[PDB]
Scaffold this active site. Structure first.
Site, PDB file in Angstrom:
ATOM      1  N   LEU A 238      52.422  22.463   1.338  1.00 22.56           N
ATOM      2  CA  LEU A 238      52.252  23.398   0.334  1.00 22.56           C
ATOM      3  C   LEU A 238      53.370  24.154   0.800  1.00 22.56           C
ATOM      4  CD1 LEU A 238      48.459  24.376   1.536  1.00 22.56           C
ATOM      5  CD2 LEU A 238      49.701  23.664  -0.400  1.00 22.56           C
TER       6      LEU A 238
ATOM      7  N   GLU B 260      44.864  33.081   4.099  1.00 19.84           N
ATOM      8  CA  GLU B 260      45.151  32.302   2.918  1.00 19.84           C
ATOM      9  C   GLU B 260      43.924  30.524   2.790  1.00 19.84           C
ATOM     10  OE1 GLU B 260      45.489  29.477   0.359  1.00 19.84           O
ATOM     11  OE2 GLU B 260      44.541  31.227  -1.235  1.00 19.84           O
TER      12      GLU B 260
HETATM   13  N1  LIG Z   1      48.770  25.027  -4.163  1.00 23.20           N
HETATM   14  C1  LIG Z   1      47.394  24.405  -3.942  1.00 23.20           C
HETATM   15  O1  LIG Z   1      46.779  24.833  -4.469  1.00 23.20           O
HETATM   16  C2  LIG Z   1      47.048  22.546  -3.574  1.00 23.20           C
HETATM   17  C3  LIG Z   1      48.544  22.722  -3.780  1.00 23.20           C
HETATM   18  N2  LIG Z   1      48.409  21.234  -3.672  1.00 23.20           N
HETATM   19  C4  LIG Z   1      49.304  20.525  -3.131  1.00 23.20           C
HETATM   20  O2  LIG Z   1      49.514  18.958  -4.575  1.00 23.20           O
HETATM   21  C5  LIG Z   1      50.908  18.172  -4.366  1.00 23.20           C
HETATM   22  C6  LIG Z   1      50.069  16.401  -4.187  1.00 23.20           C
HETATM   23  O3  LIG Z   1      49.853  16.543  -5.711  1.00 23.20           O
HETATM   24  P1  LIG Z   1      49.802  15.114  -6.901  1.00 23.20           P
HETATM   25  O4  LIG Z   1      50.828  14.324  -6.209  1.00 23.20           O
HETATM   26  O5  LIG Z   1      49.215  15.548  -7.998  1.00 23.20           O
HETATM   27  O6  LIG Z   1      48.378  15.017  -5.920  1.00 23.20           O
HETATM   28  P2  LIG Z   1      46.783  14.244  -6.040  1.00 23.20           P
HETATM   29  O7  LIG Z   1      46.161  14.955  -5.167  1.00 23.20           O
HETATM   30  O8  LIG Z   1      46.331  14.937  -7.268  1.00 23.20           O
HETATM   31  O9  LIG Z   1      47.068  12.782  -5.525  1.00 23.20           O
HETATM   32  C7  LIG Z   1      47.458  11.418  -7.415  1.00 23.20           C
HETATM   33  C8  LIG Z   1      46.688  10.736  -6.692  1.00 23.20           C
HETATM   34  O10 LIG Z   1      45.659  10.731  -6.688  1.00 23.20           O
HETATM   35  C9  LIG Z   1      44.381   9.998  -6.904  1.00 23.20           C
HETATM   36  N3  LIG Z   1      44.576  10.347  -9.111  1.00 23.20           N
HETATM   37  C10 LIG Z   1      44.583  12.122  -9.039  1.00 23.20           C
HETATM   38  N4  LIG Z   1      43.914  12.413 -10.185  1.00 23.20           N
HETATM   39  C11 LIG Z   1      43.524  11.280 -10.409  1.00 23.20           C
HETATM   40  C12 LIG Z   1      43.013  10.855 -11.981  1.00 23.20           C
HETATM   41  N5  LIG Z   1      42.428  11.667 -12.501  1.00 23.20           N
HETATM   42  N6  LIG Z   1      42.381   9.551 -11.948  1.00 23.20           N
HETATM   43  C13 LIG Z   1      42.567   8.247 -10.868  1.00 23.20           C
HETATM   44  N7  LIG Z   1      42.828   8.773  -9.511  1.00 23.20           N
HETATM   45  C14 LIG Z   1      43.395   9.923  -9.479  1.00 23.20           C
HETATM   46  C15 LIG Z   1      45.866   8.685  -7.561  1.00 23.20           C
HETATM   47  O11 LIG Z   1      45.746   8.289  -6.253  1.00 23.20           O
HETATM   48  P3  LIG Z   1      45.896   6.894  -6.037  1.00 23.20           P
HETATM   49  O12 LIG Z   1      47.535   6.450  -6.199  1.00 23.20           O
HETATM   50  O13 LIG Z   1      45.650   6.718  -4.271  1.00 23.20           O
HETATM   51  O14 LIG Z   1      44.955   5.458  -6.945  1.00 23.20           O
HETATM   52  C16 LIG Z   1      46.822   9.189  -7.498  1.00 23.20           C
HETATM   53  O15 LIG Z   1      48.285   8.887  -6.991  1.00 23.20           O
HETATM   54  C17 LIG Z   1      51.384  18.490  -2.641  1.00 23.20           C
HETATM   55  O16 LIG Z   1      52.447  19.205  -2.603  1.00 23.20           O
HETATM   56  C18 LIG Z   1      50.295  19.434  -2.147  1.00 23.20           C
HETATM   57  O17 LIG Z   1      50.516  20.546  -1.103  1.00 23.20           O
HETATM   58  C19 LIG Z   1      47.492  20.417  -3.265  1.00 23.20           C
HETATM   59  C20 LIG Z   1      45.901  20.815  -3.142  1.00 23.20           C
HETATM   60  C21 LIG Z   1      46.159  22.338  -3.607  1.00 23.20           C
HETATM   61  C1  LIG Z   2      44.139  20.885   0.460  1.00 24.41           C
HETATM   62  N1  LIG Z   2      45.112  22.573   1.140  1.00 24.41           N
HETATM   63  C2  LIG Z   2      44.662  23.202   0.916  1.00 24.41           C
HETATM   64  C3  LIG Z   2      45.079  24.643   1.669  1.00 24.41           C
HETATM   65  N2  LIG Z   2      44.949  25.802   0.903  1.00 24.41           N
HETATM   66  C4  LIG Z   2      44.146  25.971  -0.470  1.00 24.41           C
HETATM   67  N3  LIG Z   2      44.172  27.022  -0.504  1.00 24.41           N
HETATM   68  C5  LIG Z   2      43.527  27.600  -1.649  1.00 24.41           C
HETATM   69  N4  LIG Z   2      42.895  29.184  -2.844  1.00 24.41           N
HETATM   70  N5  LIG Z   2      42.765  26.270  -2.939  1.00 24.41           N
HETATM   71  C6  LIG Z   2      43.518  25.362  -2.662  1.00 24.41           C
HETATM   72  N6  LIG Z   2      42.729  24.024  -2.877  1.00 24.41           N
HETATM   73  C7  LIG Z   2      44.004  24.848  -1.098  1.00 24.41           C
HETATM   74  C8  LIG Z   2      43.984  23.404  -0.636  1.00 24.41           C
HETATM   75  C9  LIG Z   2      45.199  21.718   2.611  1.00 24.41           C
HETATM   76  C10 LIG Z   2      46.967  21.598   2.369  1.00 24.41           C
HETATM   77  C11 LIG Z   2      47.196  21.556   4.021  1.00 24.41           C
HETATM   78  C12 LIG Z   2      46.467  21.865   4.715  1.00 24.41           C
HETATM   79  C13 LIG Z   2      44.693  21.950   4.703  1.00 24.41           C
HETATM   80  C14 LIG Z   2      44.224  22.266   6.248  1.00 24.41           C
HETATM   81  C15 LIG Z   2      42.955  23.008   5.769  1.00 24.41           C
HETATM   82  C16 LIG Z   2      41.756  23.009   4.518  1.00 24.41           C
HETATM   83  C17 LIG Z   2      43.059  22.554   3.400  1.00 24.41           C
HETATM   84  C18 LIG Z   2      44.703  22.342   3.395  1.00 24.41           C
END
Ligand SMILES: NC(=O)C1=CN([C@@H]2O[C@H](COP(=O)(O)OP(=O)(O)OC[C@H]3O[C@@H](n4cnc5c(N)ncnc54)[C@H](OP(=O)(O)O)[C@@H]3O)[C@@H](O)[C@H]2O)C=CC1
Ligand SMILES: CN(c1cnc2nc(N)nc(N)c2c1)c1cccc2ccccc12
Length: 206
Positions: free
Chosen positions: A25, A32
């Site tokens: 992140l 949050e």
């Molecule tokens: N701001 C937020 O709310 C959030 C931010 N993030 C950020 O997102 C970034 C990671 O995103 P991203 O790189 O897109 O990664 P994902 O978390 O989407 O994981 C991607 C991997 O997941 C599997 N995958 C995802 N979608 C599919 C699908 N539709 N079908 C089959 N497999 C799938 C594959 O796994 P495999 O390669 O093993 O086959 C792919 O390599 C990070 O910077 C993280 O901190 C993450 C969650 C929340």
């Molecule tokens: C996947 N993720 C995360 C964090 N904050 C989020 N916030 C919002 N509003 N939505 C999400 N999908 C989040 C995911 C996390 C990323 C890194 C550390 C985490 C620790 C506890 C829970 C979630 C963690």
């Protein structure tokens, strides 16, 4: 026997749709996270005896969560990956697509199951969010809007808050967010770390 429950996407994003940077992140916001935990975990008390919610996440997101905090407690966890061999431990569920996750869940937690599913969340990352935005059952976005154009390298795939998407996606009133989330939620701007953020709920028609 499946396409009956709606999907809810939960995300924190900048005003430029930035969600991630360097596999983590772009911010450290403890409250949050507490809101994310609150929303993803909440089951109405009466149903909470036997029902839980489900969090669907991509394999890079799953790997991004420090180990101390995985799996996410008090929720059914499912990791989306084509790595059939990736060992999740503790039974944590694994599925090869969003729809294969949905089928797995319905098979696993059917009428023949002590545990029942309440709500299903998609919790990231960009790749799984892109599949979720294309899915016909995604109807709700719990969005945390971060008012700073913090540098990111991963972006939310569909600009749902913009003018182009505004006949489809609409932002609900705060009371409606609360009635959905089941508790009172902080209203308006919160500043934990040098910039403001706020909680929103967006819906569209299926
Ligand atoms: N701001 C937020 O709310 C959030 C931010 N993030 C950020 O997102 C970034 C990671 O995103 P991203 O790189 O897109 O990664 P994902 O978390 O989407 O994981 C991607 C991997 O997941 C599997 N995958 C995802 N979608 C599919 C699908 N539709 N079908 C089959 N497999 C799938 C594959 O796994 P495999 O390669 O093993 O086959 C792919 O390599 C990070 O910077 C993280 O901190 C993450 C969650 C929340
Ligand atoms: C996947 N993720 C995360 C964090 N904050 C989020 N916030 C919002 N509003 N939505 C999400 N999908 C989040 C995911 C996390 C990323 C890194 C550390 C985490 C620790 C506890 C829970 C979630 C963690």
């Amino acid at each position: 026997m499946n396409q009956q429950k709606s999907l809810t996407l939960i995300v924190a994003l900048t005003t430029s749709y930035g969600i991630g940077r360097s596999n983590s992140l772009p911010w450290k916001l403890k409250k949050e996270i507490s809101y994310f935990k609150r929303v993803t975990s909440f089951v109405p008390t009466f149903d909470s005896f036997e029902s839980m919610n489900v969090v669907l996440m991509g394999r890079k997101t799953w790997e991004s969560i420090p180990l101390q905090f995985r799996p996410l407690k008090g929720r059914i966890n499912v990791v989306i990956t084509r790595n059939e061999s990736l060992d999740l431990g503790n039974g944590i569920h694994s599925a090869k697509s969003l729809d294969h996750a949905l089928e797995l869940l319905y098979r696993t937690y059917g009428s023949e199951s002590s545990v029942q599913i309440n709500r299903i969340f998609v919790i990231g990352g960009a790749q799984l969010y892109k599949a979720a935005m294309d899915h016909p059952k995604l109807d709700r976005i719990m969005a945390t809007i971060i008012y700073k154009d913090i540098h990111c390298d991963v972006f939310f795939p569909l600009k749902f808050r913009d003018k182009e998407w505004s006949s489809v996606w609409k932002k609900e009133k705060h009371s409606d967010l609360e009635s959905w989330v089941g508790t009172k939620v902080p209203h308006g701007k919160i500043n934990e770390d040098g910039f403001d953020y706020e909680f929103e709920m967006w819906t569209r028609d299926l």
